[PDB]
Design a protein around this nucleic acid. Structure first.
Ligand SMILES: [Mg+2]
Length: 98
RNA sequence: GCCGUAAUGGCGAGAACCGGCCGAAGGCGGGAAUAGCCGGGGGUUUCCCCGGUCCGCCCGACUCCUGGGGCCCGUGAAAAGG
């Protein structure tokens, strides 16, 4: 699976929440299906997402790139530490879960 | 894309924008006009009385405060006290 191509499909067809602060809110208040975290996320951010996603029962996929590379894989000109997939519109981004 | 600077620029690692919190030198009132000063008088040995002590602008530090940026094979004390 190409992570980037499927992420751009989930963004444009479904509902994708982009950014650490909004991802945390979705985990705490919403019901996201998958959370993706960049490999070079800071220790404080990784532990926060790991803890909240655990209590929320949401799987975490660690993107194999930096937050700069995750942003490029989402066709964004900015970093993305973490993003939450709430709706996989026409992609199979949920294939990353297993 | 959007927001900038004297200059460097800033943002999903959270921008613009809106509301708030902490927060200088110093300003202003009180001190305080009763003082001091200026002018006009009367005493005596330094005392008493009278009038004014205003309006509107500008420059402005080497003094005081604040923040930004840069440099170092150089990194710019310690303790009492609080
Ligand atoms: Mg200049």
């Amino acid at each position: 699976i190409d992570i980037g191509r499927e992420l751009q499909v989930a963004i444009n067809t479904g509902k994708v929440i982009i950014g650490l602060r909004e991802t945390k809110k979705s985990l705490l208040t919403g019901a996201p299906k998958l959370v993706i975290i960049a490999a070079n996320a800071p220790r404080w951010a990784r532990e926060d997402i790991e803890y909240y996603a655990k209590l929320a029962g949401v799987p975490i996929f660690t993107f194999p790139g930096s937050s700069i590379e995750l942003g490029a894989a989402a066709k964004r000109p900015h970093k993305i530490m973490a993003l939450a997939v709430v709706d996989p519109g026409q992609s199979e981004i949920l294939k990353l879960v297993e």
